Write a protein that binds this ligand. Structure first.
Ligand code: FE
Length: 54
C-alpha cells in the first residue's frame, strides 16, 4: 500500500492507479505485484523500491 519509487529511472508506482497498461490492476499492492512485472518504461524489474509517504 502507498506509492513507491522505481529505483533509479524515476517512475513512481501508484497502487491506487495500478499499472493496468503494463498488466497491474488498480489497487494492487506493490508487494502483490508479480515479480514478472517490470517498470513501464525502464528495464530493471521490481526491486529496491522505497515507499512514498503520501
Ligand atoms: Fe524504472
Amino acid at each position: 500500500m502507498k506509492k513507491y519509487t522505481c529505483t533509479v529511472c524515476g517512475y513512481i508506482y501508484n497502487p491506487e492507479d495500478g499499472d493496468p497498461d503494463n498488466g497491474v490492476n488498480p489497487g494492487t499492492d506493490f508487494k502483490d505485484i508479480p515479480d514478472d512485472w517490470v517498470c513501464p518504461l525502464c528495464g530493471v524489474g521490481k526491486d529496491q523500491f522505497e515507499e512514498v509517504e503520501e
